[PDB]
Amino acid sequence: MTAVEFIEPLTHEEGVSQATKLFVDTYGAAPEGVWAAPGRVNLIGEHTDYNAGLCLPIALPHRTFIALKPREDTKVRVVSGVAPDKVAEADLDGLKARGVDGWSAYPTGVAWALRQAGFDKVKGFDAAFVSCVPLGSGLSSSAAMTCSTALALDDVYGLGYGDSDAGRVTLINAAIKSENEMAGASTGGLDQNASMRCTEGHALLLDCRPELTPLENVSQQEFDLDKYNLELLVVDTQAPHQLNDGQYAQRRATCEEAAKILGVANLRVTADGISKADDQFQALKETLDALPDETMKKRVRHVVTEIERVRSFVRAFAQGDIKAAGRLFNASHDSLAADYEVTVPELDIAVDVARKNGAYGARMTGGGFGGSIIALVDKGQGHEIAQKIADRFEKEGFNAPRALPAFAAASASREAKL
């Protein structure tokens, strides 16, 4: 057997070097520059973004690097280091939703979304992508690709949105629209806000109420694992799963109906009225009594309890109460498994192994149905716990997992410019 693999992040130098070489190898021309956006881990606040809730992501050090050059036509050529001999080619001129074949829908759809928003200066482009955000890990390779492209296009076309947090929300919205409308992949905005608005050493307390302005809807929370002698273990289960299989879309449909039945614009309205009540049990009971469907009650209970767990976590971590922080991780996972029903055995067994082996807490992160777990562990324990999960996976007959180093890293940025 092989020891469990840790997937290291590309350095600035490696990402620039590799994205530039793929660009020159593919297109001959030099790119105008290289941009990059990170993947993410959601610490807590899962399945709350599209309910106008609270989230708490960090940006991983793992980034997607885009070498890009604008074109004076409307042609979009893209290549990825996974498949360097397969250049995808579309044209923005009269391009419609779902008009683009395969992975290239994600970057092409960003240019489309900017044009649809009236950025008429945005024409075609050539790009090359090199990533270390692991595929199928639930760590937002999708956002790393769309957000790196949105930042690169903003820069080369001088749109003026990339150089401010509030400006980056315009580029976030284009990235989200690409994924939802061009690629046909249902997504809230958790991942794209993380990738473009996180900061090094901080978690992004993101308030997803849609009426908030950018300076109202984030709060950088201290997330210095070294201050508490901690390590955030991240394990990609590599469990076989399927994007756009309809499960994630169903959860969203279920929440929207719940909100319709409750007569509220979103479940955050419901959650906040419960949270403010003196008797939160009774406020929840009265809400779930208004939902006749037994699955819908479960989904609403998850959303309401998870939003409050975010607040609880921000307080626990600021207090250095790592046991309390870990219990909140654990209650988030347990809710996602029992009430939201978005876990699978690989996630649940990895989490149990982490819990049994000294984690303060452990949970799936991201959408679920596969992908990754995270665990708050003591510094120096991540490798041991990752290998315990790997040994257990082999006993279970599961695909080997892989792990990634993790800490709160910087958001998207320009990496190089001619």
Ligand X SMILES: OC[C@H]1O[C@H](O)[C@H](F)[C@@H](O)[C@H]1O
Q: Decide: 20 and 67 in contact? Cβ < 8 Å.
A: yes
Instruction: Check whether 49 is labelled as a binding-site residue.
Output: yes
Instruction: Check whether 195 is labelled as a binding-site residue.
Output: no
Write down the least CB distance from residue 340 to Cl ion, Å.
8
Residues with Cβ within 8 Å of residue 150, at least 6 apart in sequence: 110, 114, 171, 172, 174, 175, 178, 196
Over the window 178 to 217, marking each residue x when it contacts ligand X by CB under 6 A and - when it does not, the resulting string is ---------xx-xx--------------------------
Residues that bind Cl ion (CB under 5 A): 250-251, 254
Residues with Cβ within 8 Å of residue 124, at least 6 apart in sequence: 70, 71, 72, 73, 74, 75, 76, 91, 92, 111
d(CA 40, CA 57): 7
> How many amino acids of this chain bind ligand X (CB under 6 A)?
11
Q: Which candidate in 154, 155, 191, 339 is catalytic? A: 191
Residue 254 binding partner per list Cl ion, ligand X, none, with a CB distance cut-off of 5 to 8 Å that depends on partner kind: Cl ion
Determine, following the binding rule CB under 6 A, whether residue 68 of this chain makes contact with ligand X. Answer: no
Active-site annotation holds for 154: no
Write down the least CB distance from residue 367 to ligand X, Å.
3
Kindly tell me which of 18 and 51 has the beta carbon lying closer to ligand X: 51
Residue 250 binding partner per list ligand X, Cl ion, none, with a CB distance cut-off of 5 to 8 Å that depends on partner kind: Cl ion
Determine, following the binding rule CB under 6 A, whether residue 50 of this chain makes contact with ligand X. Answer: yes
Kindly identify the residues of this chain, within the stretch 361-390, that bind ligand X according to CB under 6 A.
366-367
Report the alpha-carbon angle 159-35-236, nearest 5: 125
b/e string for 343-381 if b means 16 or more Cβ within 10 A? bbebbbbbbebbbebebbbbbbbbbbbbbbbbbbbeeeb
Kindly tell me which of 32 and 49 has the beta carbon lying closer to ligand X: 49
Which among 89, 168, 105, 167 has a CA at the least distance from the CA of 142? 105
Instruction: Check whether 140 is labelled as a binding-site residue.
Output: yes
Determine, following the binding rule CB under 6 A, whether residue 42 of this chain makes contact with ligand X. Answer: yes
Write down the least CB distance from residue 356 to ligand X, Å.
26
Residue 303 Cα distances to 262, 275, 282, 299, angstroms: 14, 12, 16, 6
Determine, following the binding rule CB under 6 A, whether residue 339 of this chain makes contact with ligand X. Answer: no
Residues with Cβ within 8 Å of residue 227, at least 6 apart in sequence: 320
Judged by the rule CB under 6 A, the positions of this chain that interact with ligand X are: 42, 46-47, 49-50, 187-188, 190-191, 366-367
**Catalytic residue numbers?**
191
Return binding residues for ADP.
Answer: 80, 136, 138, 140-142
